[PDB]
């Protein structure tokens, strides 16, 4: 019913946040069919800072407690054809992530799939009516391969593998 994300260390319940946006990296190369693949951003802090939809919370992959869109999801990028440029996704309806306190934060499965379908809808306007696929992070250091954030001086690492594993036609 929910999407449980393994986190280290255990985020206390007061560190629950509102997911207001994502940051993605479109996988390059030559695909075999009408499929475009996206992963959590493979860049660094410069891709997150130039998004400018974040608040005071410092986070990777997912924007916590940041700017929401007015009506519908708004995706933006400096070049849609440069896979080295990240794709900034700004949600309109925040998705609440609730951390229990035993090392795992929860996310509703249906309400996350609804946001991924609206995101895949906005992505087809820039890359044509194709198949949109979300895949886990391609790797990297712990703070970027995982959904990381700060809360009260501490730094938490949450594995975001279960959040990016869907296909939308």
């Amino acid at each position, epitope marked *: 019913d929910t999407i449980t994300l393994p986190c280290r260390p255990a985020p206390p319940p007061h560190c629950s946040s509102n997911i207001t946006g994502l940051i993605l990296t479109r996988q390059g*190369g030559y695909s075999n069919a009408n499929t475009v693949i996206f*992963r959590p951003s*493979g860049g660094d802090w410069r891709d997150i800072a130039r998004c400018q939809i974040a608040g005071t919370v410092v986070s990777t992959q997912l924007f916590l407690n940041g700017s929401l869109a007015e009506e519908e999801v708004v995706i933006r990028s400096e070049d849609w*054809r440069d896979n080295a440029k990240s794709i900034c996704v700004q949600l309109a309806t925040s998705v609440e992530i609730a951390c229990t306190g035993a090392g795992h934060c929860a996310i509703s499965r249906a309400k996350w799939a609804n946001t991924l379908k609206q995101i895949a809808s906005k992505l087809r306007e820039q890359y044509g009516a194709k198949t949109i696929i979300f895949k886990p992070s391609s790797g990297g250091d712990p703070e970027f391969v995982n959904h990381s954030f700060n809360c009260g001086g501490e730094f938490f690492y949450c594995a975001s593998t279960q959040l990016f594993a869907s296909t939308w036609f």
Partner: antibody, heavy 118, light 105 residues
Framework: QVQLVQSGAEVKKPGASVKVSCKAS????????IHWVRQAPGQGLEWVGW????????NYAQQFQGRVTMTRDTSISTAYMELNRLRSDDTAVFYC???????????WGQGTLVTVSS | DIVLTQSPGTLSLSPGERATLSCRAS???????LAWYQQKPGQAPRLLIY???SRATGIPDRFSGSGSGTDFTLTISRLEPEDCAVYYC?????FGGGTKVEIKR
């Protein structure tokens, strides 16, 4: 002056794996992405993927997703590119490149010949 | 995606004449991301032109670039015997097939 020095040539058997290094110097190693380009004998250039040395993030080409892995070591300014499960048609020369800002590859390594044969 | 078609596959020219290498894109692209390279046998590619027309440092002025939309042209005003190599055009991670410039006798 900016220069890239790669590892030496490799002779591998089909099914094995190979790891190629690329040592950078003359600039801040974490400031620019490291790309890799493949060129089969008598063929053209083919982009393999880039790596962010500051964060370790990678973006592999779809045709190489699964067999390639790119890492780095910031204390020696050396980037690595590993290709597993080699086939006979994987015999090619691998270059590491750096752009003026990203894709304007002005700095190349001398190349590393990787021949696969039994 | 973006496909870069270079023509001809092999260009033969008498020493001292003008070269004209074209790079056709399958779709309309921006000129700010068009690059040209030169690769001699046994060596790595060398950046000649970036941004469709901006010449790289150390490149002789006889190399020139122009074009927009889908057609881009690399021009060698006076072909030197040292200019015999394969030339590629680039758009992000996409490379052209390459044009071999040889001497015509």
């Amino acid at each position: 002056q900016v220069q890239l020095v790669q590892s030496g040539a490799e002779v591998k058997k089909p099914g094995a794996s190979v790891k190629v290094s690329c040592k950078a110097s003359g600039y801040t190693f974490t400031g620019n992405y490291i790309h890799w380009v493949r060129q089969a004998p008598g063929q053209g250039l083919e982009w393999v993927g880039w790596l962010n040395p500051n964060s370790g993030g990678t973006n592999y080409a779809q045709q190489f997703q699964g067999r390639v892995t790119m890492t780095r070591d910031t204390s020696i300014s050396t980037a690595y590119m590993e290709l597993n499960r080699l086939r006979s048609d994987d015999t090619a020369v691998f270059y590491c490149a750096r752009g003026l800002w990203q894709w304007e590859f002005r700095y190349w390594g001398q190349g590393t010949l990787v021949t696969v044969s039994s | 995606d973006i496909v870069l078609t270079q023509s001809p596959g092999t260009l033969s020219l008498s020493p001292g004449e003008r070269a004209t290498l074209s790079c056709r894109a399958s779709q309309s692209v921006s000129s700010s991301n068009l690059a040209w390279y030169q690769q001699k046998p046994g060596q790595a590619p060398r950046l000649l032109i970036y941004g469709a027309s901006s010449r790289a440092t150390g490149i002789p002025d006889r190399f020139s670039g122009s074009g927009s939309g889908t057609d881009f042209t690399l021009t060698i005003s006076r072909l030197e015997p040292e200019d015999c190599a394969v030339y590629y055009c680039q758009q992000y991670e996409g490379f052209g097939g390459g044009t071999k410039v040889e001497i015509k006798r």
